[PDB]
């Protein structure tokens, strides 16, 4: 609900756990990471700019 993820602002995680993705989900990670910083057309391609082959007379 109201969570703050702090960063390493100055030995490893080999694998992320499926338990770890159920505690802090993907959508919660987008909001709570920024809390450490304090955040809280179609061009058919055949037309031109304005829009709405042999040049030999034979």
């Amino acid at each position: 609900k109201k969570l703050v993820i702090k960063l390493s602002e100055n030995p490893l995680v080999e694998y992320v756990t499926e338990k770890e993705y159920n505690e802090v989900p993907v959508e919660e990670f987008g909001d709570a990471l920024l809390r450490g910083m304090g955040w809280e057309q179609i061009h058919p391609d055949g037309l031109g700019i304005g829009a709405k082959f042999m040049p030999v007379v034979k």
Partner: protein
């Protein structure tokens, strides 16, 4: 000669005035136009003056494009009277044509000096760093001026130079604490700008007709330049200007067509540099202004339809679709100014004068506002940049763009739940590719359901870097010659490189199966780069052991590879809806995407009676008439989709 036509460039009058000022200032901004003698002659004065200190220190020149890095480095290697690479080198993503103990001046790109911060934080090899084309505002340039700002108090011996236009150069001065702006003007000759009378029904048919009425009804000497959007528009134009030239015969005048785009042979790149013969008219086709710059510079005509193809950020997913947009009013005026270098040129504009004034943006937006930023944030967190808002770069990204690049590095498992950079995140920095290509190579060597197929995933990833240049003709004719029944576009690229390897990398193999041999030598070079980087990480040994445990059979290998690309590209999964293929995600509903007819999955619907697949994994999205999936991948089972990335597809499926 070449030693006397360099004196007529506008920087030689400003030679000693500018060398005295770089000795005084730390950061200096050189203001002018594109290719006014600077970035070709001005790095040559710094070497001869002695800023390198007898080859101990180097000079890095930062071009924005891949094409502009190699061509300008080859042009200076002519002027320096060195071979290339020995004393004047360059550095592409996958090409490093330098020697370490002799290279004094080197012309790299914006992404490859930004990558240089990993192995050396203070950039101790370099005495002068010049950023070129800073007014283009590419993402790897906008970050690289922010990171160089942070290391200015710690190294006073570095000297920084910024080349930009005469409009953005004050904002770079405000950024570097009232930086002095030096001005190098060019010889501005008047260009007579023409507009059409109506909105044009086609900008290619109007651009081919425009070249003919300049060629027939105008006299020599004047060379034509045409700005086209992509390489598929250039080669469609070069062949069609070769067909209509053949019906004319020897009646009109000589026409040398000289295209400029990436991945080009050396016999076409030497046609860039050498001057035209008399009674000859060179027609140059290109995309950006900085590659059209020449030292002799005989061109006097410019045709512009005013379009740039650029990577627009997708609002539904985290990625960047490739989209074609009208370019900006400041960018059109850079194109019209190309004709007025030596004499009074002319500029033909396909758009009318009304749409020039009332339908174009007055100044181009920066790239950093609408991008992925997944490779960006992981790069900054590896350098110690903890706070992403307070990082002092000049135009800052929006928060919905920035929170999506954080939660996409969490699905990949490159960021910890506590926000630290994990060992996989320290691994994605090592590979010279996108961090989602580094997840596929990690899954193929380490995953409990997917290990064994790194050797097949170093192949397909190397084939996806050079997709549009692989084949001659159509692909539906070349695919039936290598393997009669493929279903997905990734396994077809695995089959092409293996059969080419089984024929001992034969030139005669590629011509039989309708495949360009010059492309496959670059794919073989990308693979040698991605395999050498997997040795230092240790994914080679983790897959040699995982192959001795289980010797896999070919019925399972195409299912291992499909799973290895789900875990690397989980947002690019498209579900067959009632209307059509539709983008599947929790953010937005969908985009109603169709399949590009160049892909092999479109062929299996028309040529074959097979039912459409339920899940399709793409590598690239693009919008011309509607949204088109390229580089397909067939996922026939929902169980492969949840069991690889369950953090997305548990609620969706």
């Amino acid at each position: 000669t070449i030693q006397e036509a360099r004196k007529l460039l506008p920087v030689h009058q400003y030679k000693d005035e500018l060398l005295q000022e770089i000795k005084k200032n730390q950061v200096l901004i050189i203001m002018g136009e594109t290719g006014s003698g600077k970035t070709t002659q001005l790095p040559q004065y710094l070497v001869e003056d002695g800023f390198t200190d007898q080859g101990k220190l180097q000079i890095a020149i930062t071009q924005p494009r891949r094409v502009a890095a190699t061509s300008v480095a080859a042009r200076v290697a002519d002027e320096m009277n060195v071979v290339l690479g020995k004393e004047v080198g360059y550095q592409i993503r996958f090409e490093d044509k330098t020697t370490p103990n002799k290279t004094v001046l080197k012309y790299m790109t914006d992404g490859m000096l930004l990558r240089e911060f990993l192995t050396d934080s203070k950039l101790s090899k370099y005495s002068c760093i010049m950023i070129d084309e800073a007014h283009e505002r590419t993402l790897a340039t906008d970050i690289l001026i922010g990171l160089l700002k942070d290391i200015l108090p710690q190294r006073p011996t570095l000297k920084l130079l910024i080349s930009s236009a005469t409009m953005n150069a004050k904002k770079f001065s405000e950024f570097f604490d009232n930086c002095p702006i030096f001005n190098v003007p060019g010889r501005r000759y008047p260009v007579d700008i023409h507009y059409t009378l109506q909105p044009e029904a086609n900008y290619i048919h109007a651009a081919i007709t425009t070249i003919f009425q300049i060629h027939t009804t105008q006299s020599l000497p004047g060379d034509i330049l045409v700005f086209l959007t992509g390489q598929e528009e250039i080669e469609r134009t070069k062949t069609k200007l070769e067909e209509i030239m053949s019906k004319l015969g020897s009646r009109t005048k000589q026409m040398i067509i000289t295209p400029i785009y990436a991945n080009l042979p050396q016999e076409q790149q030497l046609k860039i540099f050498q001057p035209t013969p008399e009674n000859c008219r060179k027609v140059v086709l290109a995309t950006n202004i900085a590659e059209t710059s020449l030292t002799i510079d005989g061109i006097r005509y410019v045709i512009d339809p005013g379009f740039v193809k650029e990577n627009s950020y997708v609002p539904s997913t985290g990625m960047t679709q490739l989209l074609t947009v009208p370019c900006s009013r400041a960018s059109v005026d850079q194109r019209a100014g190309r004709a007025g270098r030596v004499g009074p040129g002319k500029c033909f504009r396909i758009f009318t004068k009304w749409s020039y004034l009332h339908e174009l943006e007055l100044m181009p937006k920066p790239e950093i506002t609408r991008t992925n930023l997944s490779n960006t944030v992981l790069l900054l967190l590896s350098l110690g940049v903890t706070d992403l808002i307070k990082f002092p770069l000049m135009d800052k990204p929006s928060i919905p763009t920035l929170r999506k690049s954080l939660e996409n590095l969490y699905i990949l498992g490159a960021l910890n739940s506590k926000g630290t950079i994990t060992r996989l995140g320290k691994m994605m920095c090592e590979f010279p590719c996108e961090p989602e290509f580094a997840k596929v190579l990690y899954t193929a060597a380490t995953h409990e359901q997917c290990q064994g197929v790194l050797e097949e995933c170093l192949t397909i990833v190397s084939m996806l870097h050079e997709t549009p240049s692989l084949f001659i003709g159509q692909k539906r004719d070349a695919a039936a010659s290598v393997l009669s029944e493929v279903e997905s576009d990734h396994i077809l690229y695995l089959e092409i490189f293996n059969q080419w390897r089984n024929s001992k990398f034969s030139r005669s193999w590629c011509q039989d199966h309708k495949i360009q041999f010059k492309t496959m030598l670059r794919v073989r070079n990308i693979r040698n780069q991605l395999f050498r980087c997997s040795e230092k990480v240790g994914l080679v040994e983790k897959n040699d052991q995982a192959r001795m445990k289980i010797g896999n059979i070919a019925g399972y290998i195409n299912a291992r590879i499909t799973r290895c690309f789900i875990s690397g590209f989980p947002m690019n999964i498209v579900q067959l809806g009632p209307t059509g293929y539709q983008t599947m995600g929790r953010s937005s509903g969908g985009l109603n995407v169709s399949v590009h007819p160049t892909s092999i999955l479109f062929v299996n619907h028309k040529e074959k009676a097979q039912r459409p697949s339920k899940y399709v994994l793409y590598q690239q999205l693009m919008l011309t008439s509607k949204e088109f999936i390229r580089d397909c991948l067939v996922i026939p089972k929902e169980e492969w989709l949840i069991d690889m990335v369950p953090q997305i597809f548990k609620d969706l499926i």
